[PDB]
Design a protein around this nucleic acid. Structure first.
Ligand SMILES: [Zn+2]
Ligand SMILES: [Zn+2]
Ligand SMILES: [Zn+2]
Lengths: 559, 114, 65, 84, 196, 141, 159, 263, 102, 43, 133
DNA sequence: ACTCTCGATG
RNA sequence: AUCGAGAGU
């Protein structure tokens, strides 16, 4: 287990990681002192020597040099010691362990490795400061964020091995994933809250920015496109410049709820030939979505186009934003005075619901729902009554927050957060729960020693009524604690139970593979599937289309 | 540790010239000036005044990455004008304002008490 | 651990204002909010530096040798 | 056993894996001063030579595809089709 | 990082000029991202900042004692009496360009922690080195220029990819790789290298 | 003088504890809307009242500014991290010879404090400084 | 329960129907009752399904359950993946666990079962019986540090 | 005179609140940035330590002296140590100081910047004097001593600039605002009810006119007029901070232009 | 050549639904030249979408379920992870049995 | 240092849950994460 | 080289849809009672209001980088105040004897509907829009 | 009952 | 070599 199917290994590195937006998707900012240490055996040849010798000359401590040279006999020349270390005439048919350089192929992984995607070949770009740096939108497959996450890096030694990494493994080829026949990388955080504000109709950008932005995009064709507006002051729309980043032969049609080829909600999406026609761009368009601009561009133009797409979208939106700016104050959880009155009573009327069911049940009138205890039915009624209270008080808050409320602004992008996160911050936080039920009776027939025995009312059984803003009360706080202790617990137990699944799943399947007859079989030759997937079709190359033979009127089938 | 010394921001290395000029391949009458060991203080000011002159078509700058102290100006000018002049005129135009200012401040500095 | 020379964010000198600050509280009997304004600290990055700097040095000087 | 030049089912297109290692094993030989059967418009890197050797089908290798009984078919890199 | 479970590493260092700046001349010591504030509902962080602003100004202690009559409002009503906007927004200027920022920004003193775990204490990197007596594999830990474990699980991923040769190269030429002799009959490491 | 009793878990069982003594036993007889929503007096029996509620918290979480206005597992994270915070661990660090000990250069008492910081001697031996922070998208680094 | 079923006219629409949900299992005797539709009746105990309706119906439920584990959280996984797992379980004739009893007794070369929970024994009863390991298995060429019959090593190269 | 124009309003020994009329923002900025980051100054870039029995550590102490404000009025006739032709320093590109203070008294002996001691031949130029604005007469609190502790040091101040390390900053704060009312609409104010009862009004609204509610129709609005205030640290008085800012800016613009001449 | 007919079946049912005579002509007005392109194009675009012999799906399928499994975390059913634990074990001893009769 | 002196440890139905009676005696928040979670408590 | 369409309209609804700098305007054509219009408009740059009478043109006229001025000495179809340029994307048969066209001026959308606009509002990239007085 | 770094003992 | 605290999703 530990020495034969999983060894410790030479030519490897490991470091803290941190995000860098001006770095192409498939790249990895390898810090210098590591690239000073790691080494790829290159064989002398007429094609290289001139470069190659200059390295042996540079010596193992100024970046683009090298360590060890090796000769016919197989004797190791050590470049840091040795009298003859500023000398040495490189002889064809020798080798030269050398400093990893820019644009080399390397396997760059994060543990745990529960994917193909947790291992992807990148493209080196050597840098100062001691962090493996990477592009944001290679975050997901690895499942990294930059609050400490440490990451490994392996280096190939063989010429064939380099190919294997650059040809089968590399980051652009993994973009569209077989796992869920969808793309596994999207556009996240800053970039994404931006890919949107930029694109509102309202958003207007005038000349001087336009020219920088234009220029910012590398693949820019150098043709100031003609401003939508020419009159008084010739502006461009957001959409307009973002359209530059979008290549040509790219066609996308969306349609959400209120969408009409006029789109008075700037709804859906319409894109014709590297040009955006209407509709805000947000996660549905440019997320790791199925219809996804990224699913499209990858299949249509090619992987390598889509790789360079990510960068360009990023660099423009990251910029515009940098000059527009964005924030979040407690003000962004505050809400309208008369709504904090409407929320209040919206809870209060639910507190009377419960009361009345309870006083009802206290008279043996409460009817048992076929097959559950009168006490089960009471509970379920109550639980529901305050789940619907929280959610109603919550929805109530979702509306004051105006189109400028920075929390909501992220929510509309789909960058972070949700309705729930508003609810708990601005409204009431809700019913706490342990093992599916509302707070137990640990003490005898009572929750805490600050309550009378036999007390099934909300307060007493773990309903927190205030918000994460106004603040909880002692009791509330202590129930709430029990909430996400359970949470933490099964979280770190979720990880152990599952860790084992993914080991076994792997070990049984493991040796299954599609053989050269389009069968599907293990090491014994015992057939398992007669066609892979039953259609012999790689999951990547596949997508949700409609079958219009299936639906609608015998008339309109024929119309 | 991997940290590069601070002086590598305003001091030119070995065979590294303040201006390295290349002619933009995509457009015509167009030019991309690399500026080494300089930053936004400079490129922004050049760009603003590189747009006041009415015989200029296009100008923009960008710091390709903040780690390094380089920046890339791109100028495209009208049929006739050679950007190297557009830039020269520009630069001079600036210097005259800065002198102008330097005087005018020193003028009004002197009139006040303390 | 001794007063910091020059405030972090802003830059303005402040290590010259410690002994003077402590003498405004304890001696002409003033609240920290006035003292801080008198000594020429009108921003709050420059302010927070004094209202906080805690003078542990007074307590390692305590050890003999 | 064997198998003829005829009676070959086995995709007449190239797998990515076949290619992958053909590009590898060639990249190898070029990188060890063995001859290049192309003209280089101006390349040094052993792989991107072999990419060009291949994309003018002048690579002299033969894949031997194994079927799961104990048999196989031969395929010259002239025969196989580089779609991808 | 902060005080409410909002851990974060430095991504970069900018000099005072390149920072955004408030009209009063002030520049921030540290900029966090707004995207890490909705999902972990770390509201206090925001409140602290509001309170701590007020306190540094008026020259008093910020009382953030838990179960109290202190209010986001109660603070905000004070922060105004002192001439800033009551939710700690301040108009800022992008220092690159001098132009104003289109959005107003949350700005205030917020008590931050420095944590152990710095980088230079982690940045282990090997390129062949010592090997354990028994196994002849590379050694554990960076304290002695050890390897990194290409664990069972990372193998699965190389198999997934279909990179066979790479799997051999990693599992042999780096780490364990040795030659033995073997009898062509009683197929065993019985044999006898009188090798010479 | 019998003003205070020592109560364990088991005896706790047979009592009634008041939270705040003020608002929890004067006669019943407006509400600044931004104040939180505490419950009511509904209880008459009160045998001993809680000293003050913050004393349900341990050493670490007592350091947190406003943990009530905060998701409960977040507080728990800070409480495993206040113990990796760099500061002055003891005045005499200069004279103790120990493997590995880090001390901050300009230790700074916090601006936002807990009443129970006083007994934890946190303002006297801080860990952390008092930064001007800006919540914003900038370079996207 | 809700259902999408053809109108006489062509349009797919919501005939809302009546379904009974149970707490406990005896397939053997419920589908034999009056009034139920035996052609539909479903148990979450796929194990029962097998022993009643034969293996090929049991495969289908075993999938349909695994699906509901995943789909209930939101997650989509493209069929073929789950299909394979399910199909590997269900091909020795019966249901074959993904623990050491099902897939690690299953007549494979010894070394591949070594590389999993019960290691030592498997080598012993391999020993005494005198098994012959094929060396066609991933896990076995990895122990021997050779090219694996995998993407790059599934074919052979020549001249 | 010609274009760019000034009106001083308040003026002190360290404050210069002025109006800067008729200019691109571009430059009002690039001035400010330079003023921060590019004007040269003297401060301590090498401490040579003989004996330190003090509480504090060697390089802690070092750090502090680095930050110490030093006279820099005749800086522009000192040289950068990297430029002169002398091994290490020379009184032509450095200024050496000494610190000797020894715990004598029972009652806690203080070491101020006042106790720094010019050694090197100045050459009769105003350079490297610990700057003291302190009323009681002692600059900075360098460090404290007990009964029997020493500090025995040798500082070496060199010419330098903010970009390299911020000790060479000659300026703290740089108040900066334009278009007090959002006439130009460069920002989009954030609000609960009234965008204009909810923010406040800078003193800078007095020296400009309102909008008169109804008055929209034209277009094209640029930024003249910027309301600054340079707070000097003392190394240079305030006037020179703005001036040298303007000069040094002008100087590196020169250096490009003259680098076309040279190509 | 029967298997061949079967795998394709569904793909065509789409193909014939899209490329049918009212539709080609009236819906999306094609022309011969473009049409014969659409045609030759699809064929390749199909061919490209085939599985490559070598594909180690064994693992791939495991991983592809072994991952989103680790992403589950929190109407009376055994659901998520424990259910997955139940199913793969081939649980005789199961906790939420249920019949569902129509 | 204060915290580590004030520490508790428990060897081995459901003991990891914050339990009602802990109110006032044990700290609700203070606890390590993961594989000893809630078994280790702080007073 | 020429002009494609012309009409005087009158505005009914002026619609701010959670937007300050843009309004979409449903306006109708004096003259022909088989014709109406829908227009997303920068109302910060060119104000507009209730019961208004506006003048329209389309054109394809008075494609390399966009130079600006040097045109305070040049040709301009700029007797008009407000002026945009868009691509066009759909030609919808309302059925009839009646037809509508759709333009996008960088997302500022347009709807238009009549039936002489046949040999007169091409299928094309070009489409300025010039709105006067 | 993933990969990690540290700190300790017969 | 054997045990004890922390890293990250
Ligand atoms: Zn300050
Ligand atoms: Zn033998
Ligand atoms: Zn000198």
């Amino acid at each position: 287990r530990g020495n034969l199917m999983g060894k410790r290994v030479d030519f490897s590195a490991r470091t803290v990681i941190s995000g860098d937006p001006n770095l192409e998707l498939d790249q990895v900012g390898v810090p210098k002192s590591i690239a000073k240490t790691l080494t790829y055996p290159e064989v002398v040849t007429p094609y290289n020597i001139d470069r190659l010798t200059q390295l042996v000359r540079n010596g193992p401590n100024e970046h683009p040099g090298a360590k060890y040279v090796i000769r016919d006999s197989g004797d190791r020349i050590d470049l840091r010691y040795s009298k003859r270390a500023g000398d040495i005439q490189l002889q064809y048919g020798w080798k030269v362990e050398r400093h990893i350089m820019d644009n080399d192929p390397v396997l760059f992984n994060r543990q745990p490795s529960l994917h193909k995607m947790s291992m992807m070949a990148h493209r080196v770009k050597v840098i100062p400061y001691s962090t493996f740096r990477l592009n944001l939108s290679v975050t997901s497959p690895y499942n990294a964020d930059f609050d400490g996450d440490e990451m490994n890096l392996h280096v190939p030694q063989s010429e064939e091995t380099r190919a294997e990494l650059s040809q089968l493994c590399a980051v652009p080829l993994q973009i569209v994933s077989p796992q869920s026949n969808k793309p596994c990388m999207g556009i996240v955080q800053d970039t994404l809250c931006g890919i949107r504000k930029l694109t509102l109709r309202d958003t207007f950008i005038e000349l001087d920015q336009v020219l920088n932005m234009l220029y910012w995009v590398p693949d820019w064709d150098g043709v100031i496109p003609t401003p939508a507006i020419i009159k008084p002051k010739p502006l461009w729309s957001g959409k307009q410049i973002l359209s530059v980043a979008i290549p040509n032969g790219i066609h996308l049609q969306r349609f959400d709820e209120g969408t009409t080829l006029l789109s008075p909600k700037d709804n859906g999406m319409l894109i014709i030939d590297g040009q955006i026609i209407f509709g805000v761009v947000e996660k549905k368009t440019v997320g790791s979505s199925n219809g996804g601009l990224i699913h499209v561009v990858t299949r249509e133009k090619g992987p390598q186009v889509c790789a360079k797409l990510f960068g360009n979208i990023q660099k423009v939106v990251n910029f515009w934003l940098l000059h527009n700016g964005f924030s979040t104050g407690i003000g962004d959880t505050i809400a309208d005075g008369p709504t904090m009155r409407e929320i209040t009573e919206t809870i209060a009327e639910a507190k009377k619901k419960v009361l009345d069911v309870t006083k009802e049940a206290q008279a043996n009138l409460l009817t048992a729902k076929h097959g559950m205890t009168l006490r089960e039915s009471f509970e379920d009624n109550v639980v529901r009554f305050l789940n619907e209270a929280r959610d109603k008080a919550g929805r109530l808050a979702e509306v004051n927050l105006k189109d400028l409320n920075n929390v909501k602004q992220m929510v509309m992008a789909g960058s972070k957060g949700s309705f729930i996160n508003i609810a708990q911050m601005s409204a009431c936080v809700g019913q706490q729960s342990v093992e599916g039920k509302r707070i137990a009776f640990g003490f005898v027939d009572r929750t805490l020693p600050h309550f009378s025995k036999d007390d099934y009312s909300p307060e007493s059984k773990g309903f927190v009524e205030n918000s994460y803003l106004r603040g909880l009360t002692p009791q509330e706080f202590f129930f709430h604690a029990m909430g996400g202790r359970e949470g933490l617990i099964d979280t770190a137990v979720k990880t152990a139970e599952t860790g084992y699944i993914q080991r076994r799943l792997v070990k049984a399947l493991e040796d299954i593979m599609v053989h050269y007859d389009n069968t599907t079989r293990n090491s014994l030759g015992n057939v398992i599937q007669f066609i892979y997937g039953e259609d012999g079709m790689d999951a990547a190359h596949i997508e949700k289309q409609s079958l219009d033979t299936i639906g609608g009127s015998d008339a309109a089938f024929e119309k | 540790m991997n940290a590069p010394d601070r002086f590598e921001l305003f001091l030119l290395g070995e065979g590294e010239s303040k201006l390295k000029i290349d002619p933009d391949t995509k457009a015509p009458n167009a030019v991309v000036i690399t500026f080494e060991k300089e930053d936004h203080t400079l490129g922004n000011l050049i760009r603003a005044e590189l747009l006041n002159d009415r015989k200029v078509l296009f100008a923009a700058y960008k710091v390709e990455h903040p780690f390094f102290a380089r920046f890339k100006l791109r100028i495209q000018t009208t049929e006739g004008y050679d950007p190297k002049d557009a830039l020269k005129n520009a630069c001079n135009s600036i210097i005259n304002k800065l002198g102008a200012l330097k005087t005018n401040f020193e003028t009004e500095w002197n009139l006040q008490t303390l | 651990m001794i007063v910091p020379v020059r405030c972090f964010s802003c830059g303005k000198v402040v290590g010259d204002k410690w002994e003077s600050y402590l003498n405004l509280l304890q001696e002409d009997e003033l609240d920290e909010g006035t003292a801080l304004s008198r000594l020429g600290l009108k921003r709050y990055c420059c302010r927070r530096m004094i209202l906080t700097h805690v003078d542990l040095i007074e307590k390692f000087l305590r050890y003999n040798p | 056993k064997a198998i003829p030049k005829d009676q070959r089912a086995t995709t007449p297109y190239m797998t990515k894996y076949e290619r992958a290692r053909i590009l590898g094993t060639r990249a190898l030989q070029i990188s060890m001063n063995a001859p290049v059967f192309v003209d280089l418009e101006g390349e040094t890197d052993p792989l991107r030579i072999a990419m060009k050797e291949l994309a003018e089908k002048k690579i002299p290798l033969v894949i031997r595809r194994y079927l799961p009984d104990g048999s196989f078919e031969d395929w010259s890199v002239e025969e196989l089709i580089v779609d991808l | 990082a902060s005080r409410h479970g909002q851990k974060g590493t430095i991504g970069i260092t900018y000099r005072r000029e390149d920072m955004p700046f408030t009209a009063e001349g002030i520049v921030p010591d540290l900029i966090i991202n707004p995207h890490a504030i909705p999902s972990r509902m770390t509201v206090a962080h925001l409140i602290e900042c509001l309170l701590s602003k007020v306190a540094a100004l008026s020259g008093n202690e910020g009382d953030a004692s838990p179960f109290t009559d202190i209010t986001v409002e109660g603070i905000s009503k004070l922060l105004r009496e002192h001439g800033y906007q009551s939710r700690g927004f301040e108009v800022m200027y992008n220092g690159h360009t001098g132009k104003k920022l289109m959005a107003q920004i949350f700005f205030g003193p917020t008590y931050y922690q420095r944590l152990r775990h710095m980088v230079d204490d982690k940045i282990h990197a090997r390129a062949r080195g010592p090997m354990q007596v028994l196994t002849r594999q590379p050694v554990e830990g960076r304290s002695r220029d050890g390897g990194l474990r290409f664990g069972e699980m990372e193998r699965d991923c190389m198999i997934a990819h279909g990179a066979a040769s790479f799997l051999k190269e990693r599992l042999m030429e780096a780490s364990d790789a040795f030659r033995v002799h073997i009898c062509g009959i009683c197929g065993l490491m019985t044999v006898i290298a009188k090798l010479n | 003088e019998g003003l205070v009793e020592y109560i364990d878990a088991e005896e706790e069982e047979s009592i009634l504890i008041a939270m705040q003594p003020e608002d929890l036993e004067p006669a019943e007889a407006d509400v600044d809307p931004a104040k939180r929503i505490r419950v009511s007096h509904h209880a008459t029996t009160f045998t001993h009242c809680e000293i003050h509620p913050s004393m349900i918290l341990g050493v670490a979480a007592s350091i947190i500014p406003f943990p009530d206005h905060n998701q409960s597992p977040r507080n728990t994270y800070q409480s495993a991290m206040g113990k990796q915070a760099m500061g002055v661990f003891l005045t005499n660090y200069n004279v103790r010879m120990d493997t590995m000990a880090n001390i901050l250069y300009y230790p700074q008492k916090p601006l936002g404090t807990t009443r129970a910081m006083e007994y934890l001697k946190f303002r006297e031996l801080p860990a952390g400084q008092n930064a001007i922070v800006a919540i914003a998208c900038y370079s996207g680094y | 329960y809700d259902r999408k079923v053809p109108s006489p006219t062509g349009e797919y629409v919501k005939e809302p129907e009546w379904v009974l949900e149970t707490d406990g299992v005896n397939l053997s005797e419920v589908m034999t009752v009056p009034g139920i539709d035996p052609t539909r009746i479903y148990t979450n105990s796929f194990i029962d399904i097998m022993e009643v309706l034969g293996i090929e119906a049991g495969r289908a439920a075993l999938y349909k359950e695994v699906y509901n584990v995943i789909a209930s959280d939101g997650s989509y996984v493209n069929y073929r993946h789950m299909a394979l797992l399910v199909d590997v379980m269900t091909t020795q004739g019966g249901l074959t666990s993904v623990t050491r009893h099902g897939f690690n007794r299953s007549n494979t070369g010894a070394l591949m079962r070594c590389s999993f929970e019960e290691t030592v024994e498997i080598l012993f009863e391999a020993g005494a019986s005198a098994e012959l390991d094929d060396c066609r298995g991933v896990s076995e060429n990895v122990i021997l540090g050779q090219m694996a019959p995998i993407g790059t090593g599934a074919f052979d190269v020549m001249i | 005179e010609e274009g760019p124009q000034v009106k001083i309003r308040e003026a002190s020994k360290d404050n210069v609140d002025f109006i800067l009329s008729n200019v691109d923002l571009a430059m009002a900025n690039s001035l400010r940035r330079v003023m921060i980051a590019e004007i040269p100054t003297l401060a301590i870039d090498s401490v040579e330590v003989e004996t330190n029995t003090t509480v504090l550590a060697d390089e802690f102490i070092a750090h502090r002296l680095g930050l110490i404000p030093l006279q820099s009025m005749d800086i522009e006739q000192l040289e950068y140590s990297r430029d002169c032709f002398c091994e290490d320093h020379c009184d032509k590109c450095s200024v050496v100081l000494t610190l000797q203070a020894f715990g004598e008294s029972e009652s806690t002996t203080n070491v101020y910047s006042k106790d720094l001691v010019i050694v090197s031949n100045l050459m009769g130029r105003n350079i490297g004097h610990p700057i003291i604005q302190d009323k009681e007469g002692n600059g900075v609190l360098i460090c404290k001593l007990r009964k029997g502790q020493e500090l025995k040091l040798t500082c070496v101040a060199k010419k330098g600039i903010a970009k390299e390390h911020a000790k060479w900053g000659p300026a703290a704060a740089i108040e900066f605002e334009y278009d007090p009312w959002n006439k130009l609409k460069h920002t989009d104010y954030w609000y609960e009810q009234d965008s204009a009862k909810e923010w406040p009004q800078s003193k800078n609204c007095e020296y400009e006119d309102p909008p008169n509610e109804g008055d929209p129709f034209d277009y094209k609005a640029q930024a003249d007029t910027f309301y600054m205030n340079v707070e000097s640290v003392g190394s240079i008085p305030v006037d020179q901070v703005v001036v040298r800012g303007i000069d040094t800016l002008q100087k590196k613009v020169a250096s490009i232009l003259l680098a076309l001449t040279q190509m | 050549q029967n298997a061949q007919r079967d795998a394709v079946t569904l793909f065509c049912c789409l193909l014939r639904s899209r490329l049918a005579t009212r539709r080609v002509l009236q819906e999306y007005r094609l022309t011969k030249q473009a049409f014969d392109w659409v045609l030759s194009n699809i064929e390749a675009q199909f061919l490209r979408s085939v599985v490559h012999p070598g594909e180690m799906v064994g693992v791939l399928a495991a991983q592809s379920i072994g991952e989103p499994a680790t992403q589950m975390t929190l109407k009376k059913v055994t659901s998520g992870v424990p259910r997955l634990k139940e199913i793969l074990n081939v649980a005789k001893n199961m906790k939420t049995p249920s019949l569902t009769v129509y | 240092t204060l915290s580590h002196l004030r520490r508790t440890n428990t060897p081995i139905a459901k003991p990891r849950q914050l339990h009602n009676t802990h109110w006032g005696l044990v700290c609700p928040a203070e606890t390590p994460e993961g594989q000893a979670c809630g078994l280790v408590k702080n007073l | 080289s020429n002009t494609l369409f012309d009409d005087i309209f009158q505005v009914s609804e002026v619609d701010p849809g959670r937007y300050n700098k843009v309004c979409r305007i449903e306006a109708a054509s004096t003259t022909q009672d088989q014709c109406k219009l829908t227009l997303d408009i920068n109302v910060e740059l060119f104000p507009v209001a209730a019961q208004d009478s506006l003048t329209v043109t389309i054109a394809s006229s008075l494609t390399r980088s966009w130079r600006p001025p040097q045109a305070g000495d040049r040709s301009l179809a700029d007797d008009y105040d407000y002026v945009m340029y868009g691509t066009a994307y759909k030609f919808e048969e309302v059925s009839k004897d009646l037809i509508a066209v759709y333009y996008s001026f960088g997302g500022l959308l347009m709807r238009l509907e009549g039936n002489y606009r046949n040999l007169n509002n091409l299928k094309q990239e070009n489409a300025y829009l010039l709105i006067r007085r």
